[PDB]
C-alpha cells in the first residue's frame with residue numbers, strides 16, 4: 444500500500460519475486476535499483492556563456508535494505524553514481540558536484556501502531572515526501588511525517604528540514620535550504636467515487652541571517668529570509684490516475700501565499716558583490732493550476748492545462764513562489780510516466796509565470812506509454828523576474844513572451860531479462876523500463892537578441908529493479 448518504501452517512485456516497477464509481484468512471497472529485505480542514463484543538453488544559457496552543454500552518460504546504483512518487526516520498520520537506500528560529466532541521474536536533484544559520488548539517499552524508521560489502519564503510519568528520517576501534483580512536495584528530505592490514507596479520508600502532517608546533502612561531493616547546503624524549517628499538512632475526502640476535495644497548508648520559516656552591510660556576498664549566501672504560508676484548496680477527479688475509467692479527468696487548485704520576506708540588497712564593487720542592507724515586505728500572492736483530460740478510448744488521451752503564479756505587485760508582494768520542496772513532475776498526461784508540468788527543457792517554477800499546455804498521450808496496457816506536450820509561457824509582470832527554471836539567461840525588461848516548448852516522453856516497460864524480447868508476452872507487472880524523455884524550448888522575445896533560437900534537453904534512461 445501507500446506505506447511501501449517505493450510507493451512514491453515514478454518508475455512504478457516491481458522486482459521479480461517480490462511481495463508486490465506475487466502476494467504469496469515474503470516482503471523483500473533488500474534489493475537494487477540500477478539506472479543507466481544518457482543526457483544531451485544544449486544550451487542552458489541559450490549560447491550567452493561558455494559551457495552549458497552536455498552529451499554524456501552515467502550509471503547510478505541504488506541498493507536498499509528494509510526490515511519489519513510488528514508495527515516497526517526501517518529502510519535505507521544508498522546511491523553510487525559514475526558519469527562522464529555531471530548529468531542528472533536523479534530527477535529529485537561547496538556546491539560543485541563531482542562526476543562520480545556516493546550518497547545516503549533515504550534512511551528512516553517507521554511506526555504504524557498509533558492506529559489499526561494499515562494506511563496510517565509515522566515516519567522519521569530522510570524520506571521521500573510526495574503529493575500527487577508534485578507542486579508542493581516531491582523530494583527526499585529529513586522529516587517527521589504522519590500519513591493517514593483510507594477510503595473516505597486522507598490526512599498528513601509533518602515537519603522537515605535539510606541538514607546535509609549526505610553526499611561525498613557537496614560540502615554545503617544550498618542557501619535557500621540552510622536553516623529553513625518546513626511544517627505542512629493536508630486533509631481531503633473522496634466526496635464521490637474518484638472525486639476528491641481537500642485543503643493543504645505549508646509553512647516555511649527561515650532562521651538564518653543575511654550578510655551585514657559591507658560584507659562580501661557570494662553564491663553560498665542567502666538572498667532573503669522569510670516566513671511564508673501557503674494555503675491551498677484542491678479538487679481532483681482521477682487527475683493523476685493513469686488507470687481511470689471515467690471519460691473525463693480534471694484537476695483544479697488555488698493557493699494563497701502570505702507572509703513576509705526580508706530581501707538582501709547588494710551592489711557590485713570591483714568585481715565583488717557587496718551587501719548594502721535589506722528591505723522587508725509582506726507577501727500576498729496567488730497561484731492556480733487547472734487541467735482537463737479526455738480519456739478518448741482505452742489507449743488514447745488528450746487534454747489542456749492552464750496555470751498562473753502571480754508576479755510583481757506593490758513592492759513585489761504579488762510574487763508567488765513554490766515551497767522549494769516541489770518537483771512539478773506528475774502523471775498529468777494520464778500515463779504511468781511522470782512528466783514535468785512546465786516542460787522538461789524549461790522546467791518552470793510557478794512564479795510570475797502564466798502557462799498554457801496541450802497534450803496527447805497513448806498507452807498500451809502496462810507495456811508502453813507515450814506523451815506529447817506543448818507549452819506556451821508568459822511572464823505575468825514584465826519587469827519582475829521569474830523563479831527557477833532550466834534556462835540560465837537574463838530576461839529583457841518589458842517583454843512578456845518567455846517562449847514555447849514541445850516535449851516527448853516514450854516508455855517501454857518489461858520484465859524478464861536485461862532487455863525486452865520481441866517474443867515476450869504483455870507484461871503483468873514490469874521490473875524494468877527504457878525511456879526517452881526530451882524537450883525542445885524555443886525562447887521568446889523576453890530573451891532578446893544574441894540568444895540561440897532553440898534549446899533542448901533530452902534523456903535516455905534504462906532502469907532495472909532487482
Ligand SMILES: CCCCCCC/C=C\CCCCCC(=O)OC[C@@H](O)CO
Pocket residue numbers: 472508509510511517518519550551552567568569
Ligand atoms: C532516524 C534514522 C533511522 C535510520 C534507520 C536506518 C535503518 C537501515 C536499514 C534497515 C534495516 C534494519 C536492520 C534489519 C535487521 O537487522 O534485521 C531485520 C532483517 O534482517 C530481518 O527482518
Ligand SMILES: CCCCCCC/C=C\CCCCCC(=O)OC[C@@H](O)CO
Pocket residue numbers: 565589600601626627628629644645646672
Ligand atoms: C500523529 C498526529 C500528529 C499531530 C501533529 C499535528 C501537527 C500540527 C499541525 C500540522 C499542520 C501544519 C500546520 C501549519 C502551521 O502550523 O503553520 C501555520 C502558520 O504559519 C500560519 O501563520
Ligand SMILES: CCCCCCC/C=C\CCCCCC(=O)OC[C@@H](O)CO
Pocket residue numbers: 483484485849850851881882883899900901
Ligand atoms: C516531435 C518531437 C518533439 C520533442 C523533441 C525533443 C527531442 C530533442 C532532441 C532530439 C534528441 C536528440 C539529441 C541529440 C541532438 O539533438 O544533437 C546534439 C545537439 O548538441 C545538436 O543537435
Ligand SMILES: CCCCCCC/C=C\CCCCCC(=O)OC[C@H](O)CO
Pocket residue numbers: 519547607608609610614
Ligand atoms: C540500524 C543501524 C544501521 C545504520 C545504517 C548506517 C548506514 C551506513 C552508512 C550511511 C551513512 C549515513 C550518512 C552520513 C553522512 O553522510 O554524513 C554527512 C556528513 O554530515 C557531512 O556531510
Ligand SMILES: CCCCCCC/C=C\CCCCCC(=O)OC[C@H](O)CO
Pocket residue numbers: 504505506521522523545546547609610611612613614615
Ligand atoms: C555501489 C555502492 C552503493 C552504496 C552507496 C552508499 C553510500 C553511503 C554513504 C555515503 C555518503 C557518505 C558521505 C560522507 C561524506 O564525507 O560526505 C561529506 C563530504 O565531505 C562533503 O563535504
Ligand SMILES: CCCCCCC/C=C\CCCCCC(=O)OC[C@H](O)CO
Pocket residue numbers: 737739745746747801802803815816817
Ligand atoms: C500537442 C499534443 C496535441 C494536443 C491535443 C489537445 C486536444 C484536446 C482535447 C481533445 C478532445 C478529444 C475529443 C475526442 C472525441 O471527440 O471523440 C469522439 C468520438 O467520435 C466518440 O465516438
Ligand SMILES: CCCCCCC/C=C\CCCCCC(=O)OC[C@H](O)CO
Pocket residue numbers: 807811853854855877878879903
Ligand atoms: C531511443 C532509445 C530507446 C528509447 C525507447 C523508448 C520506447 C521504445 C519504443 C516504443 C515504441 C512505441 C510503439 C509501440 C507499438 O507500436 O506497439 C507495440 C506492439 O503493440 C507490442 O509489441
Ligand SMILES: CCCCCCCCCCCC[N+](C)(C)[O-]
Pocket residue numbers: 481482483498499500527528901902903
Ligand atoms: C539522448 C541523449 C543521450 C546521448 C548522449 C550519449 C553521450 C555519449 C558520449 C560520452 C562521451 C562524453 N565525453 C565526450 C565528455 O567524453
Ligand SMILES: [Ca+2]
Pocket residue numbers: 486487488489490491492493494495496
Ligand atoms: Ca553556453
Ligand SMILES: [Ca+2]
Pocket residue numbers: 555556557558559560561562563564
Ligand atoms: Ca497504522
